[PDB]
Amino acid sequence: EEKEILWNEAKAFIAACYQELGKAAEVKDRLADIKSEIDLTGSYVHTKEELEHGAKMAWRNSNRCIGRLFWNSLNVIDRRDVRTKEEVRDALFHHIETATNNGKIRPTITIFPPEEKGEKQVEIWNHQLIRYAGYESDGERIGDPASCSLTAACEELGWRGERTDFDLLPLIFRMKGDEQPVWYELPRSLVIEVPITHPDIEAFSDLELKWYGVPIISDMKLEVGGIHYNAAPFNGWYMGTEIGARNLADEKRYDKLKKVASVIGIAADYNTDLWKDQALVELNKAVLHSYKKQGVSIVDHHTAASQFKRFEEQAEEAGRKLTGDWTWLIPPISPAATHIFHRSYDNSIVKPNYFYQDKPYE
Amino acid sequence: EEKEILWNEAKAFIAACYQELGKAAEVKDRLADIKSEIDLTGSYVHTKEELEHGAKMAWRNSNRCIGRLFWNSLNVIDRRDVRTKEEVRDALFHHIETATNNGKIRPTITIFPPEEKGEKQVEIWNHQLIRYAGYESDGERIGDPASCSLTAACEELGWRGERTDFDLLPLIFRMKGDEQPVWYELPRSLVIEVPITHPDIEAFSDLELKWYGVPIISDMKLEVGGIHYNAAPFNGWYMGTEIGARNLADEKRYDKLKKVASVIGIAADYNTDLWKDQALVELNKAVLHSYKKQGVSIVDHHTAASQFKRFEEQAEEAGRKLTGDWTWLIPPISPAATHIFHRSYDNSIVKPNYFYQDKPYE
Numbered sequence: 001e002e003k004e005i006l007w008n009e010a011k012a013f014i015a016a017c018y019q020e021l022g023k024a025a026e027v028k029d030r031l032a033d034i035k036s037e038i039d040l041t042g043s044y045v046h047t048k049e050e051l052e053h054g055a056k057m058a059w060r061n062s063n064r065c066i067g068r069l070f071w072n073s074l075n076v077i078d079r080r081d082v083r084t085k086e087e088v089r090d091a092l093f094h095h096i097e098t099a100t101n102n103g104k105i106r107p108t109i110t111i112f113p114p115e116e117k118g119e120k121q122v123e124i125w126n127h128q129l130i131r132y133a134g135y136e137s138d139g140e141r142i143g144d145p146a147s148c149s150l151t152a153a154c155e156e157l158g159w160r161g162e163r164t165d166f167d168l169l170p171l172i173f174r175m176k177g178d179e180q181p182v183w184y185e186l187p188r189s190l191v192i193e194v195p196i197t198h199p200d201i202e203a204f205s206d207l208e209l210k211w212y213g214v215p216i217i218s219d220m221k222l223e224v225g226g227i228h229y230n231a232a233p234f235n236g237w238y239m240g241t242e243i244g245a246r247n248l249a250d251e252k253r254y255d256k257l258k259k260v261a262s263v264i265g266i267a268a269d270y271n272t273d274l275w276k277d278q279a280l281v282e283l284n285k286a287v288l289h290s291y292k293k294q295g296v297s298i299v300d301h302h303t304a305a306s307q308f309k310r311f312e313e314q315a316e317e318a319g320r321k322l323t324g325d326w327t328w329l330i331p332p333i334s335p336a337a338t339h340i341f342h343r344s345y346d347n348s349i350v351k352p353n354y355f356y357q358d359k360p361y362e
Numbered sequence: 363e364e365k366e367i368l369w370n371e372a373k374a375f376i377a378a379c380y381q382e383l384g385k386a387a388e389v390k391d392r393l394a395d396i397k398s399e400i401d402l403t404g405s406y407v408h409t410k411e412e413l414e415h416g417a418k419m420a421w422r423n424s425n426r427c428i429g430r431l432f433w434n435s436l437n438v439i440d441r442r443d444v445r446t447k448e449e450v451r452d453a454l455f456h457h458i459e460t461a462t463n464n465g466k467i468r469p470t471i472t473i474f475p476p477e478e479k480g481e482k483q484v485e486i487w488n489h490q491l492i493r494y495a496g497y498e499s500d501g502e503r504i505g506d507p508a509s510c511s512l513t514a515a516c517e518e519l520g521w522r523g524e525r526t527d528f529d530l531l532p533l534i535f536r537m538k539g540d541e542q543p544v545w546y547e548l549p550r551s552l553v554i555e556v557p558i559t560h561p562d563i564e565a566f567s568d569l570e571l572k573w574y575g576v577p578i579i580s581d582m583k584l585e586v587g588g589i590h591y592n593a594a595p596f597n598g599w600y601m602g603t604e605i606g607a608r609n610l611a612d613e614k615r616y617d618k619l620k621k622v623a624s625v626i627g628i629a630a631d632y633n634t635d636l637w638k639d640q641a642l643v644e645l646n647k648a649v650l651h652s653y654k655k656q657g658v659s660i661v662d663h664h665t666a667a668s669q670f671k672r673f674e675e676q677a678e679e680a681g682r683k684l685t686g687d688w689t690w691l692i693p694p695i696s697p698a699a700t701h702i703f704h705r706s707y708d709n710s711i712v713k714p715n716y717f718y719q720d721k722p723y724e
């Protein structure tokens with residue numbers, strides 16, 4: 001049944017890929033080649049062109065992503081050649097460096113060797129390459145609660161965090177044939193961070209808030225034509241609300257709204273004062289202003305939505321069906337001020353795509 | 363097929379209704395009574411108890427409603443006795459008066475005679491009993507664009523609006539056996555309106571914004587045990603965002619955000635200033651403050667969400683399945699600050715319920 005799923009997905013992908021690349025004539029011969037290769041080997045190997053466009057298609061098909069207008073400019077790094085943990089480590093370091101690009105962020109994906117018999121060659125434990133640790137000791141909460149389980153797992157393995165609110169987790173990944181993952185401390189010179197200040201409220205710095213420049217999702221599986229690239233970290237730049245309305249705002253994340261309200265000089269006593277809404281807006285203005293002042297790429301939700309509208313138009317013009325997840329596409333602040341809120345989207349799953357996979361910790 | 367649908371819905375409703383009312387023993391005899399009555403007459407007549415609880419159940423099952431915690435205190439007015447347009451008119455006037463209750467708003471439904479052969483006895487044209495007219499003449503826009511078609515239909519029938527931005531539409535409804543609807547101007551003494559001022563920004567009054575006190579939906583069909591009450595207007599009190607984030611804010615409604623930005627003294631030039639978000643918050647604070655200052659009931663979205671959480675808990679405790687429409691339940695500002703945003707809801711349709719029906723204009 002497995003070779004049949006593989007052959008079916010391969011047929012669907014190669015036809016669509018080569019059609020998009022103006023290479024429809026080469027489909028019959030390549031499919032034959034793949035057909036023999038699956039028979040003989042149990043799998044097949046993508047060409048560099050196929051892998052690159054496949055990763056691009058996968059981004060284009062990501063229903064929950066508002067940033068898809070730029071799917072075709074994704075920078076794809078082919079690291080199917082890696083065999084050692086030093087090489088994985090250095091590829092991860094390189095990804096951070098090149099994607100960060102001194103603040104002028106480049107959407108980038110690094111692709112590691114894929115699963116064979118469903119056997120992972122490389123298994124990345126981080127949720128993002130750059131993320132903050134989280135601790136809970138006797139009701140004492142430090143750092144990012146969403147990182148609590150991974151942080152605990154790292155500390156099993158001999159890492160120890162300084163227990164600041166912004167400890168950088170180390171990189172942590174397991175190689176095929178190893179029972180335990182290894183971990184490496186991130187070089188601080190690789191990691192851009194942005195202190196959060198407000199454009200007119202000087203007291204905002206008293207909060208001592210900061211966030212990292214580049215969100216690099218590293219625990220999703222990329223699927224292209226039946227090949228499972230379980231290890232394929234990717235990044236864009238942030239939309240400001242991700243940091244301002246969620247990471248810093250959620251009660252189960254950093255939970256900063258009461259402290260924001262205090263420094264901006266409003267009471268946090270009555271629901272009818274809409275103090276949470278006012279604090280959300282100021283904190284979100286602060287995030288945007290801070291990233292821009294530092295020369296680190298970021299987009300606001302209004303501009304992002306305008307871009308997504310162009311993606312929608314672009315899709316219809318190319319004759320492609322559009323898919324989307326309305327519940328993830330709407331921004332978590334002023335969603336009704338975007339066009340997204342006022343239409344609906346087909347949430348069908350089209351491949352290639354990025355998919356969740358099980359945590360090896362927890 | 364129709365008598366079978368009716369008998370099936372009747373069986374489902376009577377069992378559930380009498381079960382809730384502790385009257386399970388009376389189910390067999392009442393079902394027999396209904397069974398004979400459908401056979402003989404082609405329909406059946408609800409008891410006052412059945413109608414009241416049915417309307418309450420219908421509210422409880424309304425997936426899109428955040429205000430359902432108070433389903434059981436709905437004030438049900440039985441007007442199945444009306445036969446003339448004067449009686450319909452006076453029942454509508456009375457509904458406005460009693461629901462308004464000097465500002466201390468009572469959730470109320472008035473139930474008119476139901477469809478017979480799918481033949482309406484009374485057909486209400488208004489979307490809400492109290493709503494503002496809308497005009498578009500040569501790119502000139504006045505009033506509420508959502509009312510444009512109904513306004514045009516009224517003006518066919520000899521009504522003429524003053525072409526203020528806040529003309530009250532007249533009541534308009536058609537009686538069975540009449541080819542045209544009649545219309546009646548609303549007595550201003552029946553209609554509470556609230557001028558929009560801001561708690562600290564005195565200039566906000568320069569916008570000359572106002573809204574009506576009581577939203578009375580009058581174009582939905584109430585369905586109870588197979589009986590179609592196509593004419594059954596109902597009301598609650600407003601959640602502030604309905605007015606502040608939608609009615610006054612949407613580009614295709616009153617579109618006031620640029621003018622809000624100006625009076626609150628911020629520029630409306632750059633998306634990264636989040637001026638739309640800041641204006642939304644201030645306008646929404648203004649709406650809440652204005653209703654409260656006048657003694658007209660209203661709820662903010664935070665309190666409403668807290669109440670809805672109690673509805674959820676209340677449902678589980680009573681052993682009832684909960685249904686909801688996540689996309690309508692989340693408020694259009696700071697949705698991620700409510701618990702609603704962070705869970706999911708089963709959007710199944712359970713009856714009794716309120717349903718859309720076709721506009722007789724358009």
Ligand code: HEM
Pocket residue numbers: 055059062064065066067068070074107108109234235236237238239242299304328354
């Ligand atoms: C270029 C800048 C980008 C922006 C501004 C952007 C924006 C977003 C946002 C706001 C989300 C919602 C995430 C959340 O609420 O947690 C998202 C989800 C997502 N984005 Fe993008 N994105 C960008 C680039 C990319 C790239 C380069 C990829 C992959 C090649 C990608 C794939 C995804 C996926 C898979 C999700 C859903 C993840 C999940 O289900 O948890 N995006 N994007």
Ligand code: HEM
Pocket residue numbers: 417421424426427428429430432436469470471596597598599600601604661666690716
């Ligand atoms: C008591 C105060 C109430 C509040 C604060 C409230 C709140 C809301 C809100 C905010 C909506 C969304 C509407 C929109 O965005 O256009 C809504 C929808 C709805 N509410 Fe309520 N509601 C209340 C009372 C009632 C009552 C008394 C009924 C009926 C007996 C009702 C039935 C509904 C229905 C049917 C909808 C959906 C209408 C549609 O699909 O267009 N609600 N409610």
Ligand SMILES: CNCCN(C)c1cccc(CCc2cc(C)cc(N)n2)c1
Pocket residue numbers: 215216217234235236237238239242
């Ligand atoms: C509710 N828990 C959500 C955790 N998940 C699944 C999650 C957490 C953080 C971030 C994401 C995707 C965010 C993202 C990814 C990329 C490439 C760019 C961007 N701007 N945001 C997803």
Ligand SMILES: CNCCN(C)c1cccc(CCc2cc(C)cc(N)n2)c1
Pocket residue numbers: 577578579596597598599600601604
């Ligand atoms: C997108 N067009 C939406 C028009 N609809 C369907 C609409 C328009 C206005 C109002 C509603 C329901 C609003 C409502 C009803 C009641 C009883 C109370 C309340 N607070 N809100 C629904």
Ligand SMILES: C[C@H](O)[C@H](O)[C@H]1CNc2nc(N)[nH]c(=O)c2N1
Pocket residue numbers: 341342343344689690691
């Ligand atoms: C098509 C889309 O779902 C539509 O804009 C919905 C979104 N959720 C909503 N929610 C509420 N409360 N009111 C609305 O009118 C809408 N519109």
Ligand SMILES: C[C@H](O)[C@H](O)[C@H]1CNc2nc(N)[nH]c(=O)c2N1
Pocket residue numbers: 327328329703704705706
């Ligand atoms: C269960 C519920 O759908 C969940 O809270 C979703 C809502 N939409 C979202 N949208 C974004 N962008 N990010 C999220 O984490 C979520 N969470």
Ligand SMILES: [Cl-]
Pocket residue numbers: 215242247
């Ligand atoms: Cl993030």
Ligand SMILES: [Cl-]
Pocket residue numbers: 577604609
């Ligand atoms: Cl309304």
